[PDB]
């Protein structure tokens, strides 16, 4: 399977997650958040080693609201976009909806509020891997390829300026 190899190439050095728990699940949710942070910081450190340090994320105390920044390089210019998402109650079986609010109504591949629209292959890929993928995988497999299409398009169309 080309799809299976492409997925492994992108995520194989990201720690896999284990716990099936969402925000209402008490000590199991605290454990899931340990897994989320361990997977995210390993992904960040890998990214720095690859000269591709392309995001920062923080959460609120309960880990239910996430926010931060991503950066995209086009023609050597660096573009920054604020990002945010809420954790669904049925996470991790359900994937979170990443919003880039400053691009709301600027890309056709987006919903109201700046929620990014991924391709239809993302959702079954997440579903098949539950509960192994977490927020690091959402960034690597969801937002990262979305930026690599949409940011060059919007710069060419004169919709985004540096």
Q: How many domains does the chain have?
A: 1
Residue 159 within any structural domain of the chain: no
Domain of 47 in residue numbering reads as: 2-152
Nearest one of 2, 1, 20 to 129, comparing CA atoms:
20
Residue 103 within any structural domain of the chain: yes
Residue 162 within any structural domain of the chain: no
Whether the upstream peptide bond of residue 54 has omega within 30° of 0, thus cis, is no
Residue-wise DSSP of 134-154? -HHHHIIIIIHHHHHHHHHHH
CA-to-CA separations, 73 to 87, 106, 157, in angstroms, rounded: 28, 18, 17
Residue 44 within any structural domain of the chain: yes
Take residue 130 and report the two structure tokens written for it. 């539950």
How far is residue 151 CA from its own chain's centroid? 15
Q: Solved by what technique?
A: X-ray
Question: What CATH number corresponds to the domain at position 67?
Answer: 3.10.110.10
Phi/psi of residue 33, nearest 5 degrees: -60, -35
């Amino acid at each position: 399977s080309m799809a299976d190899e492409a997925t492994r190439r992108v995520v194989s050095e990201i720690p896999v997650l284990k716990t099936n728990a969402g925000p209402r699940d008490r000590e199991l949710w605290v454990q899931r958040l340990k897994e989320e942070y361990q997977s995210l910081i390993r992904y960040v450190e890998n990214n720095k080693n690859a000269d591709n340090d392309w995001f920062r994320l923080e959460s609120n105390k309960e880990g239910t609201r996430w926010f931060g920044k991503c950066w995209y390089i086009h023609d050597l210019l660096k573009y920054e976009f604020d990002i945010e998402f809420d954790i669904p109650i049925t996470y991790p079986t359900t994937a979170p909806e990443i919003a880039v609010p400053e691009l709301d109504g600027k890309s056709a591949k987006m919903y109201r509020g700046g929620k990014i629209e991924l391709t239809d292959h993302f959702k079954p890929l997440w579903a098949r891997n539950v509960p192994k993928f977490g927020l690091a995988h959402l960034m690597a497999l969801g937002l990262g390829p979305w930026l690599a299409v949409e940011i060059p398009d919007l710069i060419q169309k004169g919709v985004i300026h540096h």
